Subunit: 340 residues, 6 copies
């Protein structure tokens, strides 16, 4: 019954129905999503107490946003009023070789983007939570969200609260310099994190780490990661790797400690909607942590949850512990009947 | 900041879009409604702390039901698991002289209908609320919901908690005997109520009251009601009266005490959907009470809220204090712009 | 329990939702309608045995058409296979002063339009029905549908079967000559009809009748109509008249015999969709006939049914005897609850 | 042109669009389904005369239900009025490893569940049908539906009418005792059946049959089934077996007689919606029977029909003989053009 | 065949269907609107050549925006690429006394808001148009759009091109100072305008004009307006006035010159959606101008067009000259049939 | 920047949502499609100037049709008014082994079908285009469209304009004689074509060509095609071949000249909607031509475009050059993010 909070952004996602494009229809389904929303929503569905720390404008759209947070099972007690705008993006679902297309709208002028550390009573919040997840987006959105994130991490550390962080580095959306700038910001918060979500390529391409070319394969892989971990004395480092054999796609999760490495077996992956699916993996890892599960049990549970998120339309991973366990325990049951 | 709870039923409402009939389309929009849901939802939108005391099956439908309660701003902390079924009804929206058609499905075999007083920790709940509304439906649904409602009222009285009750007597859906049976049940709970919602016809047709034929008009009307009130020592009695001049329909609210009578002026009424609108009037009355408003201010506010509920599709009165006041203060403004 | 058949056309109606225009959305709801469909559908809902005599292409669209006829309660036993096309039209619903816009597609190349008398076993059909309604459209669609309609009327007369006919003359969609041509065709079938649906303007503008200018008002009106009736020895002549006072619109029905005249009182009319509403009036008249009702009872019942059809989206008048009677007997009840 | 009737239940199925969950949208498509509905609907589409024997409440929902039966091509002549409720369930469509979730609502308090043998004129019905299918659900729903089913089977036998029956045993929804109770009820009706639908596991797990452990493979399989068949002197026993190789899923149908065994070749299976697909297989078997087809032709036709049902959204197998034959005869044609 | 261009903003409008609120559904219909879009769209439907001068981001959303402009009949030749964001707002449709609620999102960080005069080849554009409408929003959105608007007006004047301008002053969305600031900007562009759209209250409340208190009624009204007009030597000044008698609402249009005044008779107004309806009135006025119509004919035509826009869902006035004339010439025809 | 025009037909396509059948829902999405529309739409998206030469009725449906052409980026300048009807078809999307079902409505009585060469100012059009594509449908629809197509080809040749033509021969929709008749018409236009789209089977089955039985495989294949090409002195001949290995389907494109042969490698094909996908391949070929690309580059680009069209719902291939190139250059990127 670990109480988890997240400091992050709420965004509006607009999606045409089925596999339609924006130019084909005026119809849309809108939802309130975001790394912190997806994470906390899934954890709330796993029956943990969750609360989102952020800001929403004091208007009907902001009110609809808070209603959505509650519906998902997330407490909106620490969602304050500020600004007038909410960040958003359009998502046109792809099919086969036609890629899914995400188009972002203004994000930095949002209620969350214009709020600063002084707008949040971190002291009061930390006193009621055991763990706090700082969304990587906070570090890059604006100087104000970055300063707030850093202060929160430092504070969380002081209160001896567990700190979680996700790398939100997207090569394609960054220039050479921006990457370096983000490097600096990540290096500033990493010293305060206990659980980190990210990939090998992040360490190399973003944090400039260099792999022991005298090593190779797993050994090289593990050496680089556990090195990064001991440097910041991280407790857990986790992520997933996508692969594809002829015809099939697979998802595999990994979980490292400074002295251990646990990888799940490749899981066939069927992609209906992958947006935000990375947050379902993290939710599974954090859940395993809250239950003091072995690294093997946690990575297996989290990887299955990640695969499940790809079969769920939209960013929010709406899964339960029983559902995930049913997939693991009963792989051949494709239809469940209840209410009899 | 009065904390209000309600003991009642949650029902599924199925409605075809626009003004379509069941035989015209397979399409539907479903919502979780009920007297207690409508009431608490509106009060939560008026910014009061609300909580629903009831049961929902431990299945995906029940889970979606709790999610809906939270979305509306109602705490689901006291919603327990029980049964497998949820009551429901279909609502085919009418137009002009074509009446709206409501068709009920099984209601008594619901999770709420099969739960008894021993399934609820009333002691613990009452300790955290200042007022409790007992939905009239509780008294007629099943012997179990009736026994639970009576026990709750008695208990609420002991704890000196304010008690609210709504007459849910529908002539058309009752036989001669059933009416008499309900009379007995109402007479049993009325001694414990402080605020009661109902109409003159209820007192006469259900409670068998007889009006002073030596009197007439308002005087006769008031004599009968304040007599009923002093008999149970009720604090507030409120309801609405619908009328129609040539071409127009009107709504008028009234609020009585043992020594006073406040009636609002007739308000033109436009009917898009009247289902549950009676609960918006009650919410307005209760809100006025929580703010210690004059009888005039409360009845005026509540009547406008009632008219507004008729313009809102569905049972849930999703109005705010500012919205109601804007209608009162700015009758000619039909379009509001925000977020500038 | 009069068994009624109709000889007519089935058409596809495409309607964008709400009050949207074709240029605003790609969305549509399609339905199978037509004078004969609307008529028989309503009569089937009034619990009479009905059957449509027509043709539909032997393809999936034609099959969906027969399924729709059955759903409405109309027997599809006499619906034969022929052609490949089905007539259709688009209906963009108007609002306020913006008129409803109907746009027709090819109608004469339909399965019904290319079928001739020899394609129908009228002898066998007439042997199982007591009344047959010949849709006025049959006389103008094509020479083949016209020849079939005339033969059916003659035959129906021989078998001493009651014959009903509706004037389907639309001034706006006819040239000077076409009107004259249709005059001839109507004069050919009228000698075989018992019950006729039409208006005063039809007699004057289409049948070239001339009113006694020495008379005026009702007397003149009645003289012209009963004159037309005795000439063809018609049993019943019925129709409706639309009027408008300041602010309100009204509908009024009239029913004539060679020696009587019954007019209903003006009924306030609210227009959501008037397409095909004329067929609901006729259905009410025919129903009154089947029940051997007085002219007053029939015209009152039919006029209310006509008003109700205007509140129902789409051409099909989906009303029941109880519903109509409820409107007459309980004018102030706008919401009906059942299933308790 | 075999005339087939079915004694069974009509249920409401609620399904959110696409692959959405109940917690994601208020939107739904509702349909009238049930074993007897699915079966007769498919057979009617195969052009056989069909009629459903059951009860529906005398309200608008019940009326919409009868309209749906007719639309599907099923006669509603023997659908009587009774009760007020209709059983129902929600179906949230799964995708990939996310299973489809079915949630049932009250089923036993339905119009069909409260009706007894005395409410049905079986004598009159049997006189107009050549075959009658008794839905296995009848035996377990309520004592009243069970007693009615047994009486109907006995009667059908007396009139020498062919009797069909489907095992509706779901391990997951039964306790140890309930299974035994159902065993008894099945043993009571089996002596009257000619054609039975079920699986090997039913015989072993439900009917407690024991396989010759001295045998193995097909021989053992066949020995057990033909033993069960001769015991009740059944004419046909049929069912399907689902299997899965790496990557692909398959469906295979089997048809036994007391002296023969016909199995179809594995057919690749693509699952869009499997609910009720078992009734499409049965419809194919019964159709083959009505045409006096060889066991090979019947099992091949039925298996393809079963695969097709999985590609059709919803429970109702809306297939035609030509469509099934086209799949068999032209496996590479994925697009058919008509109406040219 | 006057060629008209407009310099303005394109915005995204999100609207839930029917009269639903944001908190009731995730469903939306999105459209590309804006003063310049609404104006040019209607004029294009009136068959004039139109072109919008603005910027849209070079992304899929911007591309969908240009597609919408073309669909409406507006040339997108002068729509350049710039920025990444598009302004937007949500519109929850009201009903009866429940007002319509508009909630704006970020508008100043749009592609249009960040573009400056140097980004537009006004010289080249002006050479191909006879008239240019400068949207009042340009003057208040950003300093860059303001500077561009002013430069365009000056240039248009030099080329002797007709210049149109609309007051976009909304009291409710402005502070005391902002109003004064806008006063200055309007005073700067007014000297270059020929046709101006606005109301009396704009002159008084925004431009600080003072009415001759020694005068009254029409005389006073006209004195103030023709004074404002001669000061800037304006050619035409037009607008509308909304009024309401008991039960009904009315719309009335007025058109002034320095020496004349033409007012239309009050037109009953039915409000389905008034957003942008003001642009339909302007389109009617401009159309009358392009046809060199009398002031009476222009104001009558424009007022009817304005009333029609209120019956059309959405901001875009999709009316034609024939449609408007049909309403004027045939007030009692509520249904038009074509394609016969 | 090649300016391309097409002479062809516009049709209405009606499609139920998802994979629903006509008998399952009244809902539909309608679109304006046709060989010429699909072709020009894709080319316009590839940024070439396009214009459709055809006729549309002068009614609201025809107007909506022109609006759709513009939205797609196609100039509607040469779309004239004529007739009253528009051809159409219904498309029920298949799934797995359930084929997609297309049902045509009347096509020959359309505005395009009743127009003749004298209704088109080919001289004026040809003067503004560099290439003209004559849709094969023109040759078979009606004698009038055929005569117009032939005249246009002859004229285009005179003006030395590039001429493109597509074989629109569907074996299944033709009798023995009709095929021969079409042979004659194709032989008449082929002498004027430069670029032709079709398959080997067309040459053999329609044009009666005979393959060198002394040859085999590729050599035989190429001999037959280059023989057909030199006979009419064609410049380019292109088409695609569908194949299927166990489990997978593939698409392969080929491009021939009189002296060369270029075939693309098999591309895995995923079929969501193949209707009109053949026009996306042609658009890719023509685009390659306009860019003077090598045969290899053109066939590779076009085949990928063809595969992409199968993943797009509806007939219109809405792809861009960058999108196609992204699929070729980045095969493993299934999600693209923009607007950052
Ligand atoms: Mg996802
Ligand atoms: Mg209401
Ligand atoms: Mg109607
Ligand atoms: Mg199925
Ligand atoms: Mg408007
Ligand atoms: Mg395609």
């Amino acid at each position: 019954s670990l109480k988890i909070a997240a400091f992050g952004e709420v965004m509006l996602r607009f999606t045409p129905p089925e596999y339609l494009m924006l130019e084909q229809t005026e119809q849309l389904r809108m939802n309130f999503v975001g790394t912190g929303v997806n994470l906390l929503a899934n954890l709330a569905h796993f029956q943990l107490e969750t609360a989102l720390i952020t800001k929403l404008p004091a208007n009907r759209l902001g009110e609809a946003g808070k209603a959505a947070l509650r519906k998902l099972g997330i407490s909106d007690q620490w969602v304050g009023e500020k600004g007038d705008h909410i960040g958003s993006f359009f998502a046109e679902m792809g099919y086969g070789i036609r890629p899914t297309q995400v188009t972002y709208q203004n994000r930095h002028q949002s209620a969350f983007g214009i709020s600063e550390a002084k707008d949040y009573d971190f002291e009061a919040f930390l006193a009621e939570v055991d763990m706090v997840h700082i969304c990587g987006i906070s570090l890059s959105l604006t100087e104000k969200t970055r300063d707030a994130a850093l202060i929160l991490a430092q504070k969380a550390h002081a209160y001896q609260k567990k700190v979680c962080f996700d790398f939100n580095y997207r090569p394609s959306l960054n220039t050479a310099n921006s990457a370096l700038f983000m490097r600096q910001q990540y290096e500033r918060i990493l010293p305060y994190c206990d659980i980190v979500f990210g990939s090998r390529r992040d360490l190399v391409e973003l944090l400039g780490f260099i792999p022991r070319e005298d090593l190779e394969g797993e050994a090289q892989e593990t050496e680089l990661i556990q090195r990064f971990m001991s440097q910041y004395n991280l407790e857990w480092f986790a992520g997933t790797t996508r692969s594809h054999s002829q015809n099939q796609n697979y998802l595999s999760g990994y979980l490292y400690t400074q002295n251990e490495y646990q990888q799940s077996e490749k899981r066939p992956l069927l992609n209906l909607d992958r947006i935000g699916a990375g947050d379902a993996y993290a939710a599974g890892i954090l859940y395993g942590y809250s239950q003091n599960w072995s690294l093997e049990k946690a990575v297996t549970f989290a990887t299955v949850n990640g695969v499940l998120a790809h079969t769920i339309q939209g960013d929010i991973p709406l899964t339960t512990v029983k559902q995930v366990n049913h997939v693991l325990e009963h792989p051949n049951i494709d239809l469940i009947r209840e209410g009899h």
